[PDB]
Amino acid sequence: VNLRMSWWGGNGRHEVTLKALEEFHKEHPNINVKAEYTGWDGHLSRLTTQIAGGTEPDVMQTNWNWLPIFSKDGTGFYNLFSVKEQLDLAQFDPKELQQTTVNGKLNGIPISVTARIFYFNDATWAKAGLEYPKTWDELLAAGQVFKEKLGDQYYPVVLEHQDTLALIRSYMTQKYNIPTIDEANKKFAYSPEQWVEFFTMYKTMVDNHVMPSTKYYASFGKSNMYEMKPWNGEWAGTYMWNSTITKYSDNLTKPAKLVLGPYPMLPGAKDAGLFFKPAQMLSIGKSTKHPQESAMLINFLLNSKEGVELGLERGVPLSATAVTQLRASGVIKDEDPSVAGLNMALELPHKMTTSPYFDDPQIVSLFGDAIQYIDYGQKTVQETAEYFNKQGDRILKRAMR
Description:
The chain is α+β, with helices and mostly antiparallel strands. It has 16 helices and eleven strands. It is classed as sugar binding protein.
């Protein structure tokens, strides 16, 4: 049995991957793996040619957005439910697998995921004399306290349009317990009025000093957010991916740092309204003359003692046994606020999962546009709500096709 595995990464990744494949082959002398690794540059292009002409590898490292690219109907990759006997699926939360399932077909297993949560500048919150918010109302209320007590340059948080998207959406899910995207009907699922409440919520936050408006943000801003001067502790936190937080925290003015915050909840909410994003995945090529061996390879990499021991080269593993192992071997920390942030999100009550079309960059860019028309007085909240509804449904209609 001669299998092909592709991936992209840098030398570190290639080394630990090549090492894991020798480990696999030791335990499976009959199964050989042709490794087809490159850097990220041109990877998508080489893979696109292979998948389209049916010549892709048995096992591929893939991105979540490869589901929109290659598997809009679920058939672009081999359905992993077909090989559930080689693959210990119970290691991966079914919430997680739902996000890599298209029309009932399991298209990928997430290697690791990241979630957005709050982190705060402790020194600045200490000066505000405020606890971190437990509710949306306390978040709102923090705007006015920062403004009045510390001064007008001070904001509880700073949000780039993408963080705001995810944040107001989380509020919507907590309130309504409803998917943002209707996948059956390939469109946004909010009613007209919910979109107005969405954008009205954004205007409320900005009007109440909770974060910089896009105009105020732009006025500094040729840069990475954490390299901006107000990020002197004037912008006192962030709604951000756990797996990138250290860079943000490190550019603070010591002894100041980022502390993991509470997750704001509506009283009685049963669903925190989270956004877990697969950092990457493993997929079986719709082409494989060897589906079961390909599953054995996936299983080995994600779940086996020897395989897991891949380390954190692709981030903290999603696999429950991997996590357990890498904690026990001291490789995963607990206290490091990037690992701690993920663990907190995982453990919050949550039920709605995110469609990969929600992370479409056209969608993110549209939302950017929408908040700017607001902040620059070009559209009212209402004209913006409708514009987003409409333009967003035209993106989803094309993309989800």
